[PDB]
Design a protein around this ligand. Structure first.
Ligand SMILES: O=C(O)CCC(=O)C(=O)O
Ligand SMILES: O=C(O)CCC(=O)C(=O)O
Ligand SMILES: [Mn+2]
Ligand SMILES: [Mn+2]
Length: 343
């Protein structure tokens, strides 16, 4: 039912790249999502990542809970700690942020959220790193095609995503265990571009754009999208399909395009067996600021590092990472890093 596209290995800006970019935009504007074909290596790396996740989630909770850091938000989040629209969600999550050693200048300087991933083991680490490298190559192709489809300079988005704050939620949803099956409530993702992968079980639903339907700007405090539309059609079931990933826009793409793209609402229904999935977020650099592309006189911005840091401090207010940000006033580094820049 969803449209499927094959991305070229390199995007150069030829007229055929532009036509493809236009078709991607159209598919987002019609369906809110599309599929991209994966080759055998991309597929193999996806399956290996799922298998490492399955093996890790079988480890005792005492061990899983130890995969945490007071420097980065990377690591384990137990089920029931995350909340959407006020109702706790069901998946357990391992978040992979940029994996920076304590010798990296940003970690040495104590920038908020910067630090080494607390990996469960080296085998899990290698599976996730090599999967995320392929996801990143796809994200860059997608962002060049999107710029081209809007008749923007080819590097409009990728200039912001150099050394971008790419990160991935590695998710396991439990089987249904009662009448309740809302695994994650309706929400939109806070980032730029989302690439999603899943096993064969099934449970992700997305909402296409709806003519005449008002959508909130979820990056603004007084316009949360959480919970909206949850019990009203249309919700498109994202059918597990071999040999594809799916792609949809996040809040920052809605912001930059002034709503010409909408951040795709999505939710997860628990299945009668456990379900593994990965949600990859291809993001601006921690120091980059998103801006409105088509309203040049608009002064509003989204400073990405501030956006991410505030989000994660609110989501995990008791995590050791948040406590150390507060104890050491790490937010002050964000203020400092903008001091002498051209706004
Ligand atoms: C709430 C609800 O209906 C569910 O979790 O299935
Ligand atoms: O891909 C999925 O299963 C949903 C994950 C999701 O919506 C999220 O992590 O924000
Ligand atoms: Mn999401
Ligand atoms: Mn969150």
């Amino acid at each position: 039912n969803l449209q499927t596209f094959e991305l070229p290995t390199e995007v150069t800006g030829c007229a055929a790249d532009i036509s493809l970019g236009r078709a991607l935009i159209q598919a987002w504007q019609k369906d809110g999502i599309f599929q991209i074909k994966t080759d055998s290596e991309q597929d193999r790396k996806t399956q290996e990542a799922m298998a490492a996740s399955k093996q890790f989630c079988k480890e005792p909770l005492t061990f899983k809970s130890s995969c945490v850091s007071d420097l980065t938000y990377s690591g384990y989040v137990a089920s029931g700690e995350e909340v959407t629209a006020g109702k706790p969600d069901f998946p357990e999550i391992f978040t992979v942020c940029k994996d920076l050693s304590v010798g990296d200048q940003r970690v040495k300087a104590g920038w908020p959220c910067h630090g080494p991933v607390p990996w469960p083991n080296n085998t899990y680490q290698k599976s996730m790193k090599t999967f995320m490298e392929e996801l990143g190559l796809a994200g860059e192709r997608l962002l060049k095609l999107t710029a081209l489809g809007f008749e923007l300079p080819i590097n409009t988005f990728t200039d912001l995503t150099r050394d971008g704050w790419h990160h991935m939620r590695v998710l396991r949803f439990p089987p249904q265990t009662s009448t309740l099956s809302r695994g994650i409530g309706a929400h939109t993702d806070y980032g730029l571009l989302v690439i999603a992968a899943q096993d064969d079980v099934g449970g992700l639903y997305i909402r296409p754009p709806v003519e005449g339907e008002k959508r909130n700007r979820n990056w603004l405090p007084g316009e949360s999208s959480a919970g909206m539309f949850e019990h009203d059609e249309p919700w498109t079931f994202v059918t597990p399909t071999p040999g594809v990933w799916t792609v949809f826009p996040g809040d920052i793409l809605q912001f930059m395009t002034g709503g010409q793209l909408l951040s795709t609402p999505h939710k997860v229904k628990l299945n009668t067996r456990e379900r593994f999935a990965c949600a990859y977020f291809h993001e601006p650099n921690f120091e980059a600021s998103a801006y409105p592309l088509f309203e040049p006189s608009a002064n509003e911005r989204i400073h990405y590092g501030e956006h991410f840091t505030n989000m994660f401090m609110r989501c995990y207010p008791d995590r050791i990472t948040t406590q150390r940000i507060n104890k050491e006033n790490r937010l002050a580094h964000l203020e400092d890093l903008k001091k002498y820049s051209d706004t």
